[PDB]
């Protein structure tokens, strides 16, 4: 496969876009581990189908996110899938902004040069702030970890779709996108 | 004396130091009833309050509930000013940064909009210039201003971001009569 021998970690990979990304990297011969929270049964079936390793992790819980990344050693590719009241808004910010930041920083300091960090945006006005934040974060991270030979890209899906997003993710993780970083890609 | 904002109530989140203090002075000069929140020195906040004749109240901008509460306690305010803003940062301080620069401006603006009359003015002050956390926060504010303007538009409430006395002047102008149609934009000084 195109990613044979590569170590991949996918946060929030049990369902939808996340699951498609898991399937894509496994099909391309990569060693894949992914995380899940509420959907245990979905993660179980995905692990059974692909052979990928599933680990429970609360994406809203910051320390859990940092821990699961840290325990993954020198990963080659990190994928952070955001997924889908004042508490609802704060939850949205933690998944769209906080979790991708902490995971990316933790991963980047463990990655070899050529490492790829990929963030999948979530699918009122907190959304506009979240999307904008990810675009800004992509630019900032690229500046920060560019000298390390690490690329950072955001894939923002529209309001099937998972397979197409996974294709974009795979391309961005590949050799043809080595000079593409600090970007948000709308698909 | 009376001025441009006589009879108007202004709430300034984080107006104890720097740009915040300048904005406090400017609105008092323009005759407004000014209240501001402080996070650090009680002595400095009390000093500024007595010097300017403004109200000072403690509030940690990182605390969502405290931010929402202090806005609610302000009643039917006319102008809201949210003043946002090391070798290595720990995870908690990063989350604090995001809460101060992203969470607080959102919740404060949303809560203030529920209390404002037509013509109400919301003004967010950006951080003074690892870059990633800063870049994300600045971009977030720009996207937030546009998104909230659509929600606040039919209410007659405008919202703008001022990204850094020059700031205080731009703040007072955006809060003035001429900028009644100006909303949802980020303005660099």
PDB file of N, CA and C in Angstrom, chain B residues 114-175:
ATOM      1  N   UNK B 114     -28.918  40.022  24.418  1.00  0.00           N
ATOM      2  CA  UNK B 114     -30.227  39.720  24.988  1.00  0.00           C
ATOM      3  C   UNK B 114     -30.714  40.838  25.907  1.00  0.00           C
ATOM      4  N   UNK B 115     -29.808  41.743  26.269  1.00  0.00           N
ATOM      5  CA  UNK B 115     -30.111  42.790  27.238  1.00  0.00           C
ATOM      6  C   UNK B 115     -30.116  44.183  26.617  1.00  0.00           C
ATOM      7  N   UNK B 116     -29.502  44.312  25.445  1.00  0.00           N
ATOM      8  CA  UNK B 116     -29.333  45.613  24.810  1.00  0.00           C
ATOM      9  C   UNK B 116     -30.595  46.121  24.121  1.00  0.00           C
ATOM     10  N   UNK B 117     -30.757  47.452  24.069  1.00  0.00           N
ATOM     11  CA  UNK B 117     -31.792  48.077  23.243  1.00  0.00           C
ATOM     12  C   UNK B 117     -31.322  48.175  21.796  1.00  0.00           C
ATOM     13  N   UNK B 118     -32.174  48.667  20.902  1.00  0.00           N
ATOM     14  CA  UNK B 118     -31.766  48.889  19.520  1.00  0.00           C
ATOM     15  C   UNK B 118     -30.682  49.958  19.462  1.00  0.00           C
ATOM     16  N   UNK B 119     -29.619  49.676  18.717  1.00  0.00           N
ATOM     17  CA  UNK B 119     -28.501  50.595  18.619  1.00  0.00           C
ATOM     18  C   UNK B 119     -27.369  50.211  19.553  1.00  0.00           C
ATOM     19  N   UNK B 120     -27.553  49.107  20.272  1.00  0.00           N
ATOM     20  CA  UNK B 120     -26.533  48.600  21.173  1.00  0.00           C
ATOM     21  C   UNK B 120     -25.243  48.293  20.438  1.00  0.00           C
ATOM     22  N   UNK B 121     -24.116  48.499  21.113  1.00  0.00           N
ATOM     23  CA  UNK B 121     -22.809  48.332  20.485  1.00  0.00           C
ATOM     24  C   UNK B 121     -21.944  47.326  21.237  1.00  0.00           C
ATOM     25  N   UNK B 122     -21.509  46.287  20.532  1.00  0.00           N
ATOM     26  CA  UNK B 122     -20.588  45.310  21.095  1.00  0.00           C
ATOM     27  C   UNK B 122     -19.220  45.459  20.450  1.00  0.00           C
ATOM     28  N   UNK B 123     -18.198  45.638  21.277  1.00  0.00           N
ATOM     29  CA  UNK B 123     -16.850  45.846  20.772  1.00  0.00           C
ATOM     30  C   UNK B 123     -15.858  44.890  21.423  1.00  0.00           C
ATOM     31  N   UNK B 124     -15.154  44.131  20.593  1.00  0.00           N
ATOM     32  CA  UNK B 124     -14.166  43.179  21.082  1.00  0.00           C
ATOM     33  C   UNK B 124     -12.760  43.680  20.788  1.00  0.00           C
ATOM     34  N   UNK B 125     -11.919  43.710  21.816  1.00  0.00           N
ATOM     35  CA  UNK B 125     -10.547  44.168  21.656  1.00  0.00           C
ATOM     36  C   UNK B 125      -9.606  42.975  21.581  1.00  0.00           C
ATOM     37  N   UNK B 126      -8.836  42.901  20.502  1.00  0.00           N
ATOM     38  CA  UNK B 126      -7.931  41.788  20.286  1.00  0.00           C
ATOM     39  C   UNK B 126      -6.647  41.895  21.085  1.00  0.00           C
ATOM     40  N   UNK B 127      -5.807  40.870  20.973  1.00  0.00           N
ATOM     41  CA  UNK B 127      -4.542  40.824  21.695  1.00  0.00           C
ATOM     42  C   UNK B 127      -3.516  41.759  21.066  1.00  0.00           C
ATOM     43  N   UNK B 128      -2.705  42.398  21.904  1.00  0.00           N
ATOM     44  CA  UNK B 128      -1.642  43.269  21.414  1.00  0.00           C
ATOM     45  C   UNK B 128      -0.485  42.449  20.850  1.00  0.00           C
ATOM     46  N   UNK B 129      -0.016  42.837  19.669  1.00  0.00           N
ATOM     47  CA  UNK B 129       1.077  42.132  19.010  1.00  0.00           C
ATOM     48  C   UNK B 129       2.431  42.753  19.335  1.00  0.00           C
ATOM     49  N   UNK B 130       5.537  30.119  20.140  1.00  0.00           N
ATOM     50  CA  UNK B 130       4.372  29.515  19.520  1.00  0.00           C
ATOM     51  C   UNK B 130       3.346  30.549  19.097  1.00  0.00           C
ATOM     52  N   UNK B 131       2.946  30.497  17.831  1.00  0.00           N
ATOM     53  CA  UNK B 131       2.010  31.473  17.288  1.00  0.00           C
ATOM     54  C   UNK B 131       0.617  30.874  17.110  1.00  0.00           C
ATOM     55  N   UNK B 132       0.546  29.545  17.133  1.00  0.00           N
ATOM     56  CA  UNK B 132      -0.673  28.810  16.791  1.00  0.00           C
ATOM     57  C   UNK B 132      -1.895  29.221  17.611  1.00  0.00           C
ATOM     58  N   UNK B 133      -1.729  29.329  18.925  1.00  0.00           N
ATOM     59  CA  UNK B 133      -2.844  29.688  19.799  1.00  0.00           C
ATOM     60  C   UNK B 133      -3.319  31.114  19.533  1.00  0.00           C
ATOM     61  N   UNK B 134      -2.366  32.013  19.311  1.00  0.00           N
ATOM     62  CA  UNK B 134      -2.673  33.404  19.002  1.00  0.00           C
ATOM     63  C   UNK B 134      -3.367  33.534  17.649  1.00  0.00           C
ATOM     64  N   UNK B 135      -2.871  32.792  16.665  1.00  0.00           N
ATOM     65  CA  UNK B 135      -3.430  32.826  15.317  1.00  0.00           C
ATOM     66  C   UNK B 135      -4.869  32.324  15.305  1.00  0.00           C
ATOM     67  N   UNK B 136      -5.113  31.233  16.022  1.00  0.00           N
ATOM     68  CA  UNK B 136      -6.446  30.648  16.105  1.00  0.00           C
ATOM     69  C   UNK B 136      -7.437  31.608  16.759  1.00  0.00           C
ATOM     70  N   UNK B 137      -7.011  32.248  17.844  1.00  0.00           N
ATOM     71  CA  UNK B 137      -7.869  33.168  18.585  1.00  0.00           C
ATOM     72  C   UNK B 137      -8.234  34.404  17.765  1.00  0.00           C
ATOM     73  N   UNK B 138      -7.246  34.982  17.090  1.00  0.00           N
ATOM     74  CA  UNK B 138      -7.478  36.161  16.258  1.00  0.00           C
ATOM     75  C   UNK B 138      -8.447  35.859  15.117  1.00  0.00           C
ATOM     76  N   UNK B 139      -8.247  34.719  14.463  1.00  0.00           N
ATOM     77  CA  UNK B 139      -9.124  34.307  13.372  1.00  0.00           C
ATOM     78  C   UNK B 139     -10.527  34.020  13.885  1.00  0.00           C
ATOM     79  N   UNK B 140     -10.600  33.396  15.057  1.00  0.00           N
ATOM     80  CA  UNK B 140     -11.876  33.072  15.687  1.00  0.00           C
ATOM     81  C   UNK B 140     -12.725  34.320  15.900  1.00  0.00           C
ATOM     82  N   UNK B 141     -12.093  35.385  16.385  1.00  0.00           N
ATOM     83  CA  UNK B 141     -12.787  36.642  16.647  1.00  0.00           C
ATOM     84  C   UNK B 141     -13.372  37.247  15.376  1.00  0.00           C
ATOM     85  N   UNK B 142     -12.613  37.180  14.288  1.00  0.00           N
ATOM     86  CA  UNK B 142     -13.066  37.707  13.006  1.00  0.00           C
ATOM     87  C   UNK B 142     -14.285  36.942  12.499  1.00  0.00           C
ATOM     88  N   UNK B 143     -14.234  35.619  12.600  1.00  0.00           N
ATOM     89  CA  UNK B 143     -15.350  34.786  12.195  1.00  0.00           C
ATOM     90  C   UNK B 143     -16.529  34.940  13.135  1.00  0.00           C
ATOM     91  N   UNK B 144     -16.229  35.215  14.399  1.00  0.00           N
ATOM     92  CA  UNK B 144     -17.264  35.398  15.408  1.00  0.00           C
ATOM     93  C   UNK B 144     -18.045  36.686  15.166  1.00  0.00           C
ATOM     94  N   UNK B 145     -17.323  37.753  14.831  1.00  0.00           N
ATOM     95  CA  UNK B 145     -17.930  39.058  14.593  1.00  0.00           C
ATOM     96  C   UNK B 145     -18.904  39.018  13.421  1.00  0.00           C
ATOM     97  N   UNK B 146     -18.516  38.323  12.357  1.00  0.00           N
ATOM     98  CA  UNK B 146     -19.364  38.201  11.177  1.00  0.00           C
ATOM     99  C   UNK B 146     -20.605  37.370  11.483  1.00  0.00           C
ATOM    100  N   UNK B 147     -20.404  36.239  12.151  1.00  0.00           N
ATOM    101  CA  UNK B 147     -21.497  35.341  12.478  1.00  0.00           C
ATOM    102  C   UNK B 147     -22.511  35.947  13.428  1.00  0.00           C
ATOM    103  N   UNK B 148     -22.026  36.691  14.419  1.00  0.00           N
ATOM    104  CA  UNK B 148     -22.906  37.304  15.407  1.00  0.00           C
ATOM    105  C   UNK B 148     -23.641  38.515  14.847  1.00  0.00           C
ATOM    106  N   UNK B 149     -23.014  39.202  13.896  1.00  0.00           N
ATOM    107  CA  UNK B 149     -23.619  40.375  13.274  1.00  0.00           C
ATOM    108  C   UNK B 149     -24.903  40.006  12.540  1.00  0.00           C
ATOM    109  N   UNK B 150     -24.909  38.825  11.928  1.00  0.00           N
ATOM    110  CA  UNK B 150     -26.094  38.328  11.242  1.00  0.00           C
ATOM    111  C   UNK B 150     -27.203  38.032  12.243  1.00  0.00           C
ATOM    112  N   UNK B 151     -26.812  37.554  13.419  1.00  0.00           N
ATOM    113  CA  UNK B 151     -27.765  37.227  14.471  1.00  0.00           C
ATOM    114  C   UNK B 151     -28.230  38.474  15.217  1.00  0.00           C
ATOM    115  N   UNK B 152     -27.379  39.495  15.254  1.00  0.00           N
ATOM    116  CA  UNK B 152     -27.672  40.708  16.017  1.00  0.00           C
ATOM    117  C   UNK B 152     -28.216  41.821  15.125  1.00  0.00           C
ATOM    118  N   UNK B 153     -28.034  41.664  13.817  1.00  0.00           N
ATOM    119  CA  UNK B 153     -28.504  42.629  12.836  1.00  0.00           C
ATOM    120  C   UNK B 153     -29.952  43.069  12.985  1.00  0.00           C
ATOM    121  N   UNK B 154     -30.899  42.118  12.903  1.00  0.00           N
ATOM    122  CA  UNK B 154     -32.326  42.432  13.058  1.00  0.00           C
ATOM    123  C   UNK B 154     -32.690  42.979  14.439  1.00  0.00           C
ATOM    124  N   UNK B 155     -31.767  42.897  15.393  1.00  0.00           N
ATOM    125  CA  UNK B 155     -31.991  43.458  16.719  1.00  0.00           C
ATOM    126  C   UNK B 155     -31.536  44.913  16.782  1.00  0.00           C
ATOM    127  N   UNK B 156     -30.834  45.356  15.744  1.00  0.00           N
ATOM    128  CA  UNK B 156     -30.308  46.708  15.703  1.00  0.00           C
ATOM    129  C   UNK B 156     -29.006  46.823  16.472  1.00  0.00           C
ATOM    130  N   UNK B 157     -28.439  45.675  16.826  1.00  0.00           N
ATOM    131  CA  UNK B 157     -27.190  45.627  17.573  1.00  0.00           C
ATOM    132  C   UNK B 157     -26.011  45.363  16.643  1.00  0.00           C
ATOM    133  N   UNK B 158     -24.982  46.198  16.745  1.00  0.00           N
ATOM    134  CA  UNK B 158     -23.783  46.031  15.937  1.00  0.00           C
ATOM    135  C   UNK B 158     -22.666  45.391  16.752  1.00  0.00           C
ATOM    136  N   UNK B 159     -21.777  44.673  16.074  1.00  0.00           N
ATOM    137  CA  UNK B 159     -20.625  44.082  16.739  1.00  0.00           C
ATOM    138  C   UNK B 159     -19.380  44.209  15.869  1.00  0.00           C
ATOM    139  N   UNK B 160     -18.301  44.706  16.466  1.00  0.00           N
ATOM    140  CA  UNK B 160     -17.048  44.895  15.749  1.00  0.00           C
ATOM    141  C   UNK B 160     -15.843  44.464  16.574  1.00  0.00           C
ATOM    142  N   UNK B 161     -14.769  44.094  15.886  1.00  0.00           N
ATOM    143  CA  UNK B 161     -13.530  43.724  16.554  1.00  0.00           C
ATOM    144  C   UNK B 161     -12.440  44.746  16.258  1.00  0.00           C
ATOM    145  N   UNK B 162     -11.810  45.251  17.314  1.00  0.00           N
ATOM    146  CA  UNK B 162     -10.680  46.156  17.169  1.00  0.00           C
ATOM    147  C   UNK B 162      -9.393  45.414  17.509  1.00  0.00           C
ATOM    148  N   UNK B 163      -8.577  45.158  16.492  1.00  0.00           N
ATOM    149  CA  UNK B 163      -7.354  44.383  16.667  1.00  0.00           C
ATOM    150  C   UNK B 163      -6.114  45.271  16.661  1.00  0.00           C
ATOM    151  N   UNK B 164      -5.473  45.424  17.830  1.00  0.00           N
ATOM    152  CA  UNK B 164      -4.250  46.222  17.952  1.00  0.00           C
ATOM    153  C   UNK B 164      -3.026  45.492  17.403  1.00  0.00           C
ATOM    154  N   UNK B 165      -4.547  54.657  23.280  1.00  0.00           N
ATOM    155  CA  UNK B 165      -5.405  55.805  23.015  1.00  0.00           C
ATOM    156  C   UNK B 165      -5.994  55.732  21.610  1.00  0.00           C
ATOM    157  N   UNK B 166      -5.200  55.234  20.667  1.00  0.00           N
ATOM    158  CA  UNK B 166      -5.658  55.059  19.295  1.00  0.00           C
ATOM    159  C   UNK B 166      -6.771  54.019  19.236  1.00  0.00           C
ATOM    160  N   UNK B 167      -6.646  52.989  20.067  1.00  0.00           N
ATOM    161  CA  UNK B 167      -7.665  51.953  20.162  1.00  0.00           C
ATOM    162  C   UNK B 167      -8.936  52.515  20.789  1.00  0.00           C
ATOM    163  N   UNK B 168      -8.773  53.241  21.892  1.00  0.00           N
ATOM    164  CA  UNK B 168      -9.901  53.817  22.619  1.00  0.00           C
ATOM    165  C   UNK B 168     -10.683  54.795  21.750  1.00  0.00           C
ATOM    166  N   UNK B 169      -9.972  55.511  20.885  1.00  0.00           N
ATOM    167  CA  UNK B 169     -10.603  56.437  19.963  1.00  0.00           C
ATOM    168  C   UNK B 169     -11.444  55.710  18.933  1.00  0.00           C
ATOM    169  N   UNK B 170     -10.914  54.604  18.420  1.00  0.00           N
ATOM    170  CA  UNK B 170     -11.630  53.787  17.447  1.00  0.00           C
ATOM    171  C   UNK B 170     -12.826  53.101  18.100  1.00  0.00           C
ATOM    172  N   UNK B 171     -12.656  52.720  19.362  1.00  0.00           N
ATOM    173  CA  UNK B 171     -13.731  52.112  20.140  1.00  0.00           C
ATOM    174  C   UNK B 171     -14.896  53.083  20.307  1.00  0.00           C
ATOM    175  N   UNK B 172     -14.586  54.294  20.763  1.00  0.00           N
ATOM    176  CA  UNK B 172     -15.599  55.318  20.990  1.00  0.00           C
ATOM    177  C   UNK B 172     -16.310  55.712  19.698  1.00  0.00           C
ATOM    178  N   UNK B 173     -15.600  55.623  18.576  1.00  0.00           N
ATOM    179  CA  UNK B 173     -16.181  55.975  17.286  1.00  0.00           C
ATOM    180  C   UNK B 173     -17.150  54.898  16.810  1.00  0.00           C
ATOM    181  N   UNK B 174     -16.745  53.638  16.943  1.00  0.00           N
ATOM    182  CA  UNK B 174     -17.603  52.516  16.578  1.00  0.00           C
ATOM    183  C   UNK B 174     -18.848  52.469  17.459  1.00  0.00           C
ATOM    184  N   UNK B 175     -18.738  53.036  18.656  1.00  0.00           N
ATOM    185  CA  UNK B 175     -19.854  53.091  19.589  1.00  0.00           C
ATOM    186  C   UNK B 175     -20.716  54.324  19.339  1.00  0.00           C
TER     187      UNK B 175
END
